[PDB]
Structure 1
Amino acid sequence: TLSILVAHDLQRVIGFENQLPWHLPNDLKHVKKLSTGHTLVMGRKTFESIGKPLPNRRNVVLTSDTSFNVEGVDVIHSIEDIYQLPGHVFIFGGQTLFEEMIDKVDDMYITVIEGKFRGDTFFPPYTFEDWEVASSVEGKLDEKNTIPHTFLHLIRKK
């Protein structure tokens, strides 16, 4: 499978100043669940944001930089390289990757953050005319997760 994995808010903000605008442990545990044992593909800036590879899965960074060679990370240098990765591949960010891949992926795992944040990076617009809701699960609120949020699994129609 080729999947998108993304959290975006009511206006499709994904980012601010190279960070997530929200603090939401549950969603990061969501990410852990989904992608552990599989492969994440991410652009260089996103990799730089996270700082190092995520444990217990394959980390692939897409970059133009041929100097790039990082302990625990596989480098690719074209979009086309994605399609030769074995396994369940998650497109993991950021704006540029999402824009490039959204028409290409089988399905999307979206966490809708039910707020409006200040952002400088965005998920591309999409229509539910194009995308079937395989599931929609309200995330649980509590002391440490205080933003309402919904896990969507969408699958391309037709």
Structure 2
Amino acid sequence: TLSILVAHDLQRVIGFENQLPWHLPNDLKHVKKLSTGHTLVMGRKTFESIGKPLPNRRNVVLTSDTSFNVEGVDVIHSIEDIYQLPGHVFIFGGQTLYEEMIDKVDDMYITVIEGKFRGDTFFPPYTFEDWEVASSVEGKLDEKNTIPHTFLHLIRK
């Protein structure tokens, strides 16, 4: 399976100055549950924003840098390399990778953050004309989770 995994706001912001614009522990839990024991594929910049691989899953980084080597990280140098990765593979960011992959994925797991944040990086536009809502689950508001959010699972029609 090839899936997108993304959190974006009401205007499809995903990032600002190499960081997530919001703090939402519930969403990190959602990522952990979905991707543990599977594979994440991310662009070089997304990886460096996090700085280290996420535990208990395969971390694959896409870069043109032939010197790129990080312990606990597998490197690929082409989009075509993604299709040869076994198991459930989640496209994990950022903007460039999403733009390259949105047309190709089976599936999207989107956390819609119901706010308008300042951003410099964006998820590409998409229409529900192309995507069936497999599930839509409201995130629970919390002392630690104070932004309304909805977990969408979208499947290509």
2:18 is the alignment partner of 1:9: no
Q: Distance in 2 between matches of 1:108 and 1:32?
A: 16
Q: Distance in 1 between matches of 2:89 and 2:118?
A: 29
Deviation at 1:12, TM superposition (A): 0.3
Deviation at 1:152, TM superposition (A): 0.0
Q: Distance in 1 between matches of 2:104 and 2:50?
A: 25
Q: Distance in 2 between matches of 1:20 and 1:117?
A: 10
Unaligned runs of 5+ in 1: none
- What residue in structure 1 maps to residue 95 of structure 2? 95
Deviation at 1:102, TM superposition (A): 0.1
Deviation at 1:63, TM superposition (A): 0.2
Q: Distance in 1 between matches of 2:25 and 2:69?
A: 30
Q: Normalising to structure 1: TM-score of the pair?
A: 0.99
Q: Deviations over 1:66-105 (max 9, x none)?
A: 0001100000000000000000000000000000000000
Q: Normalising to structure 2: TM-score of the pair?
A: 0.99
Q: Distance in 1 between matches of 2:121 and 2:89?
A: 22
The secondary structure found in structure 2 opposite 1:92 is strand
1:1-158 matched pairs, under 5 angstroms? 1-156=1-156, 158=157
- Equivalent pairs: percent with the same residue? 99
Q: Distance in 1 between matches of 2:106 and 2:153?
A: 11
Deviation at 1:135, TM superposition (A): 0.1
Q: Distance in 1 between matches of 2:4 and 2:65?
A: 24
Deviation at 1:120, TM superposition (A): 0.2
Q: Deviations over 1:127-155 (max 9, x none)?
A: 00000000000000010000000000000
Q: Distance in 2 between matches of 1:35 and 1:149?
A: 19
Stretches (4+) displaced over 2 A? none
Number of positions where the alignment pairs a residue of Structure 1 with one of Structure 2: 157
Question: What RMSD, in angstroms, separates the aligned Cα atoms of the two structures?
Answer: 0.4
